Design a binder for this molecule. Structure first.
Ligand SMILES: *[C@@H]1O[C@H](CO[C@H]2O[C@@H](C)[C@@H](O)[C@@H](O)[C@@H]2O)[C@@H](O[C@@H]2O[C@H](CO)[C@@H](O)[C@H](O)[C@H]2NC(C)=O)[C@H](O)[C@H]1NC(C)=O
Ligand SMILES: *[C@@H]1O[C@@H](C)[C@@H](O)[C@@H](O[C@@H]2O[C@H](CO)[C@@H](O)[C@H](O)[C@H]2O)[C@@H]1O
Ligand SMILES: *[C@@H]1O[C@@H](C)[C@@H](O)[C@@H](O[C@@H]2O[C@H](CO)[C@@H](O)[C@H](O)[C@H]2O)[C@@H]1O
Ligand SMILES: *[C@H]1O[C@H](CO)[C@@H](O)[C@H](O)[C@@H]1O
Ligand SMILES: *[C@H]1O[C@H](CO)[C@@H](O)[C@H](O)[C@@H]1O
Ligand SMILES: *[C@H]1O[C@H](CO)[C@@H](O)[C@H](O)[C@@H]1O
Ligand SMILES: *[C@H]1O[C@H](CO)[C@@H](O)[C@H](O)[C@@H]1O
Ligand SMILES: *[C@H]1O[C@H](CO)[C@@H](O)[C@H](O)[C@@H]1O
Ligand SMILES: *[C@H]1O[C@H](CO)[C@@H](O)[C@H](O)[C@@H]1O
Ligand SMILES: *[C@H]1O[C@H](CO)[C@@H](O)[C@H](O)[C@@H]1O
Ligand SMILES: *[C@H]1O[C@H](CO)[C@@H](O)[C@H](O)[C@@H]1O
Ligand SMILES: *[C@H]1O[C@H](CO)[C@@H](O)[C@H](O)[C@@H]1O
Ligand SMILES: [Mg+2]
Lengths: 105, 48, 215, 124
């Protein structure tokens, strides 16, 4: 299946930067492993590097503004051809849940 | 001061590879031992 | 009022890159009619772009894997130095993985040696630590996440010299302890090694997939 | 691979104009994005202007924007730097540079091929 080929993966935001254009296979676009690909302008930009976990995102706002709550942060396996650490396909995620406290009373 | 080191039957010579040749899988373990022995002999000596 | 137009397209550029995808071009000029005293501006673009494909894979430089396990803190051609005032050494190994297609070899030392004492299976006196910082709510996204903190029997490390100066080239070594000791302490709540406690996390938010959230 | 020959320098009065030209190798001309640099007495080499392989996309340093104009002639394997309103601080050896670019509208600031240079001296 053809795909849009981009020249740069930003990684700080997960965006596909520098459109080389389209009408080309995923194998030929990911010969250069510094490139990236996505389908149309819908999103999910995957780099052509071997699959590796991205950076943990910032902690979400606490579920209540009073007493003990719970907050989440994500991490998305980004890459192509292979798996991340833990039998994880490219596109799947991993969460960390932590108890927060905006106001202690 | 014209001392000369002559190579004979009691002399022993082995190549210590460069950094990229050590990354080959045969010279992987070889560069480990010759590097450890360098530290082993400037720290511990002989125990005989 | 003269209407300008495009001229002949020039020679196409060869494919710049030897691997992967690249981009070629053709150049045209607005030189044959030329807009004079006004008019338009030739209508369109003076440049076409096209993707060229060489169909051959590209170099990838090797990366270091994580360090291995430390070797035992013993002496070569001796015995062991467990429960003794003897500083020893131990080694550790890395592996270069992922180097393909004439890529760059891994840069750095593939071995790591540091100095050590040995408290492997050593009976050491202990004291209970204070309550650790509350862990993560596990399992996240699963049914009923719970935190966990714990107190563990921390061994009293013996007051040895942390800095041992050797001679030869006068090299002084930051010496650190290695091994799994046997910490001796009084029982707390029917347990000798580690006593923990769990508390459920309150107001757990539901996990929504970010690709399912954007859409 | 590619060779670069600058021309057009000389001694100009302050406020005057000068047009530099840079000839590159003919068979490999449209492959390389090109630009201008300069190195003043006692100073590091600094970026002046860049042009893509197209001649349609340009980039300029803030010190020369509005005064200098870079152009490209893809018929005659040359680029040009039209320098207007010259000041004594523009006195430098001006270098033509060439660099491999995948995209044809990309302007570069990093270049791996350099000419021998042309001397421009501006007197007040
Ligand atoms: C050998 O030890 C020194 C001392 O610094 C550390 O010593 C430990 C015993 C412990 O107290 C630890 O908290 C302390 O950081 C290392 O030197 C530097 O020391 C400064 C002073 O605090 C630290 O701020 C630095 O982080 C530290 N490291 C640097 C500058 O790289 C030293 O690194 C260490 N190793 C060697 C090979 O000498
Ligand atoms: C964040 O700020 C706090 C000061 C509250 O105003 C929060 O609103 C809710 O207030 C009720 C009591 O009126 C509590 O029971 C809730 O826990 C709290 O969410 C506000 O969201
Ligand atoms: C031509 O031959 C190929 C076999 C590769 O060795 C190519 O190397 C790659 O060149 C492009 C730029 O031309 C870079 O993006 C790559 O990083 C590089 O690996 C060579 O050009
Ligand atoms: C998330 O967790 C830590 C930072 O908290 C690092 O290991 C890394 O940034 C990971 O992405
Ligand atoms: C959440 O926790 C702290 C801020 O409270 C930081 O490490 C970071 O912003 C993380 O997302
Ligand atoms: C140039 O481009 C096209 C022909 O390729 C037309 O729109 C028109 O002739 C214009 O001059
Ligand atoms: C260039 O493109 C085509 C020929 O390939 C024509 O429309 C015309 O000659 C233009 O100059
Ligand atoms: C091994 O050594 C330390 C961790 O002990 C880090 O520098 C790194 O993870 C390396 O692989
Ligand atoms: C060697 O040292 C300790 C084990 O005593 C840990 O930090 C780790 O296992 C390392 O490999
Ligand atoms: C652990 O428990 C208490 C401190 O909590 C003391 O009796 C002693 O430190 C024991 O090791
Ligand atoms: C944990 O519990 C309390 C503090 O919450 C104290 O008794 C002590 O710090 C213990 O470690
Ligand atoms: C966990 O709970 C609170 C922080 O939310 C503190 O009492 C302490 O840090 C404990 O480990
Ligand atoms: Mg003896």
């Amino acid at each position: 299946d053809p795909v849009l080929c981009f020249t740069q993966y930003e990684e700080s935001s997960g965006k596909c930067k520098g459109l080389l254009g389209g009408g080309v296979s995923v194998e030929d676009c990911c010969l250069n492993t510094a490139f990236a690909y996505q389908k149309r302008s819908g999103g999910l930009c995957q780099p052509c590097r071997s699959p590796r976990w991205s950076l943990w995102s910032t902690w979400a706002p606490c579920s209540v503004t009073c007493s003990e709550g719970s907050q989440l942060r994500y991490r998305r396996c980004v890459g192509w051809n292979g798996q991340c650490s833990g039998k994880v396909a490219p596109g799947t995620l991993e969460w960390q849940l932590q108890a927060c406290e905006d106001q202690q009373c | 001061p014209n001392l000369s080191y002559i190579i004979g039957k009691d002399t022993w010579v082995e190549h210590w590879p460069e950094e990229d040749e050590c990354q080959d899988e045969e010279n992987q373990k070889q560069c480990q031992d010759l590097g450890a022995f360098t530290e082993s002999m400037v720290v511990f000596g002989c125990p005989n | 009022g003269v209407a300008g137009g495009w001229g002949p397209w020039g020679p196409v550029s060869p494919c710049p890159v030897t691997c992967g995808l690249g981009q070629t071009m053709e150049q045209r000029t607005c030189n044959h009619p030329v807009p004079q005293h006004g008019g338009p501006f030739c209508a369109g673009d003076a440049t076409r772009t096209h993707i060229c494909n060489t169909a051959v894979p590209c170099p990838v430089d090797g990366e270091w894997d994580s360090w291995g396990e430390w070797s035992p803190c013993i002496r070569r051609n001796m015995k062991s130095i467990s429960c003794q005032e003897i500083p020893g050494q131990q080694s550790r190994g890395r592996t270069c993985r992922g180097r393909k297609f004439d890529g760059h070899r891994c840069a750095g030392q593939q071995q790591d040696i540091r100095h050590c004492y040995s408290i492997q299976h050593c009976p050491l006196k202990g004291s209970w630590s204070e309550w650790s910082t509350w862990g993560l709510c596990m399992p996240p996204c699963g049914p009923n996440p719970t935190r966990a903190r714990q107190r563990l029997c921390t061994p009293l490390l013996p007051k040895y010299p942390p800095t041992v100066s050797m001679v030869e080239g006068q090299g002084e070594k930051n010496v650190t302890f290695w091994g799994r000791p046997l910490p001796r302490c009084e029982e707390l709540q029917g347990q000798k090694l580690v006593v923990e406690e769990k508390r459920p996390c309150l107001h757990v938010p539901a996990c929504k997939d970010p690709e399912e959230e954007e859409l | 691979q590619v060779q670069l020959v600058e021309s057009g320098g000389g001694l100009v009065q302050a406020g005057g104009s000068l047009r530099l030209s840079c000839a590159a190798s003919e068979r490999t001309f449209t492959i390389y994005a090109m630009g201008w640099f300069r190195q003043a007495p006692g100073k590091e080499r600094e970026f002046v202007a860049a042009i893509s392989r197209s001649g349609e996309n340009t980039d300029y340093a803030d010190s020369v924007k509005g005064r200098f104009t870079i152009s490209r002639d893809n018929n005659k394997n040359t680029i040009s730097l039209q320098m207007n309103s010259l000041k004594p601080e523009d006195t430098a050896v001006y270098y033509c540079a060439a660099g491999r670019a995948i995209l044809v509208h990309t302007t570069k600031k990093e270049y791996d091929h350099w000419g021998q240079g042309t001397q421009v001296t501006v007197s007040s």
